[PDB]
């Protein structure tokens, strides 16, 4: 027995706003062992190095960010790179530009997961292709995680309703569309996050007049095994 509002809090949890002294603002959404943070990093601003037991996956959605993981510093272009900072590995960043950076982090710690990364921490685009006709996706791949950018066209662009054992978590980064998880449909906006546990049915349809974009993350990988 799950109410409408009950289900909303599970699959599309209400974010909290976090503000740091340095000026960074974060929108934080949580379900169980996984946290999604959308960060707004102001111009010419440092994010002090730190480290934690949780693994963290990061990506720039807008702007350009100087990112440090371990002793590897790398310029991050919007949506063209991701990094993984394994547990306890120190990491921080600087917005070294005149413009605000919008970024996304996933912080996670779940049993029976080994958190590896490329030797230099950063992932480049593995492959871009249509997942479904007209639906362009872009993959970033590790053993235990698969990042999939998706463009869902307007005018009926749709991911049919389905499920899989893979956990799938994500966040809308453009336009709008309807997403349903089990018995719950939400109109996604920029920043709306969703969390699907194993075997929870879900789908999406974009009945707007323009394409929408999303970031979707599989644990473990679903397409590039």
**Binding of residue 185 to ligand PPY (CB under 6 A):** no
What's the CA gap between 127 and 47, in Å, rounded?
31
Give the one entry of Fe ion, Co ion, ligand PPY, none that residue 155 binds, where binding means its C-beta sits below a cut-off of 5 to 8 angstroms depending on kind. Fe ion
Question: Which is nearer to Fe ion, 127 or 207 (by Cβ)?
Answer: 207
CB of 155 to Fe ion, least distance (A): 4
Instruction: Choose among Fe ion, Co ion, ligand PPY, none what residue 116 binds, the Cβ cut-off being 5 to 8 Å by kind.
Output: none
Q: Is 81 helix (H, G, I), strand (E, B) or coil?
A: strand
- 29/95 with CB nearer ligand PPY: 29
Closest CB to ligand PPY among residues 4, 160: 160
* 99 belongs to an annotated ligand binding site: no
In a 13 Å sphere around the CA of 87, the CA atoms on its Cβ side amount to 8
**Distance separating alpha carbons of residues 63 and 38, to the nearest angstrom:** 14
Closest-CB residue for ligand PPY? 204
Q: Is 26 annotated as a binding residue?
A: no
Number of residues that bind Fe ion (CB under 5 A): 1
* C-alpha dihedral, 10 to 11 to 14 to 18, nearest 10°: 100
Beta strands in 70-220 (DSSP E): 72-77, 81-85, 91-95, 101-108, 122-124, 127-132, 135-141, 146-152, 157-162, 167-174, 177-181, 184-188, 193-196, 202-206, 212-219
Residue 173 within binding range of ligand PPY, rule CB under 6 A: no
SS3 38: strand
Binding segment for ligand PPY (CB under 6 A), chosen from 14-22, 94-102, 121-129, 214-222, is 214-222
- Tell whether 202 is in a known binding site: yes
Of 37 and 79, the one with the shorter C-beta distance to Co ion is 37
- Pair 93, 67: CB distance under 8 Å: yes
Name which position in 214, 215, 219, 221 contacts ligand PPY (CB under 6 A). 214
Tell me whether residue 41 or residue 82 sits nearer to ligand PPY (CB atom): 82
Of the candidates 101, 216, 217, 221, which one interacts with ligand PPY according to CB under 6 A? 216
For residue 43, the SS3 value is coil
Query: Binding to ligand PPY by residue 150, rule CB under 6 A?
Result: yes
Binding residues: 50, 52, 56, 91, 162, 164, 168, 202, 223
Residues that bind ligand PPY (CB under 6 A): 150, 152, 159, 168, 179, 202, 204, 214, 216, 222
């Amino acid at each position: 027995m799950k109410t409408k509002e009950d289900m909303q809090e599970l699959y599309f949890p209400t974010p909290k706003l976090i503000e740091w002294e340095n000026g960074v603002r974060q929108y934080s959404t949580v379900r169980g062992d996984t946290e999604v943070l959308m960060s707004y990093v102001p111009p010419h601003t440092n994010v002090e190095p730190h480290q934690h037991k949780e693994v963290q996956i990061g990506m720039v959605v807008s702007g350009e960010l100087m990112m440090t993981v371990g002793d590897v510093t790398r310029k991050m272009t919007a949506l063209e790179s991701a990094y993984i900072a394994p547990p306890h590995v120190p990491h921080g960043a600087r917005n070294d530009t005149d413009q605000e950076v919008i970024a996304i982090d996933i912080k996670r710690l779940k049993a029976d997961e080994t958190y590896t990364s490329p030797e230099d921490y950063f992932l480049d685009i593995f492959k871009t292709r249509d997942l479904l006709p007209g639906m362009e996706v872009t993959f970033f791949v590790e053993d235990w995680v698969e990042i999939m950018l998706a463009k869902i066209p307007g005018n009926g662009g749709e991911m049919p309703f389905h499920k899989h054992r893979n956990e799938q978590i994500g966040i809308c980064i453009g336009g709008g569309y309807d997403m349903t998880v089990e018995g719950c449909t939400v109109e996604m906006k920029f920043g709306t996050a969703y969390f699907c546990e194993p075997r929870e049915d879900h789908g999406a349809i974009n009945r707007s007049e323009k394409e929408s974009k999303s970031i979707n993350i599989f644990f473990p990988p679903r397409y590039n095994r």
